[PDB]
């Protein structure tokens, strides 16, 4: 499924995501946005590790998540990475909470770095009610 901004929007604050470890909503708005374009069958296979990006904020299979063929890897979140591929975004939610609770917080994506931080990211909640 293919999020309307707006939709995510309330959707990410009913699941608790405001304020998650210190992230603003809109902070996540910002990454789901450059990460897949808030879709959730996104999928991009890494050639130069073997790992594979899942869903709408783009986990990876060396830590997150089982894809059982990505080598030598961990499922720190203990799901199925096609778990991730659901139009229903609660288990990636859940991920994406596992994946902050780490040290490096919301920066473990580099997009979001490249994208977001430092930036005026009220653009991806304004007008949406939350």
């Not at 060396?62 to 979140?77: E, I, S």
């Not at 975004?89 to 931080?117: F, L, M, S, Y």
């Not at 909640?125 to 939350?130: A, D, E, F, K, L």
């Amino acid at each position: 499924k293919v999020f309307e901004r707006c939709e995510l929007a309330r959707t990410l604050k009913r699941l608790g995501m405001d304020g998650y470890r210190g992230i603003s909503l809109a902070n996540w708005m910002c990454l789901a946005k450059w990460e897949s374009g808030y879709n959730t069958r996104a999928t991009n296979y890494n050639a130069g590790d073997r790992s594979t990006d899942y869903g709408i904020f783009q986990i990876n299979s060396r830590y997150w998540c089982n894809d059982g063929k990505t080598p030598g890897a961990v499922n720190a979140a203990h799901l199925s990475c096609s778990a991730l591929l659901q139009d229903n975004i609660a288990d990636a939610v859940a991920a994406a909470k596992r994946v902050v609770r780490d040290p490096q917080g919301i920066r473990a994506w580099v997009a979001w770095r490249n994208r977001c931080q430092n930036r005026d990211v009220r653009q991806y909640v304004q007008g949406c009610g939350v």
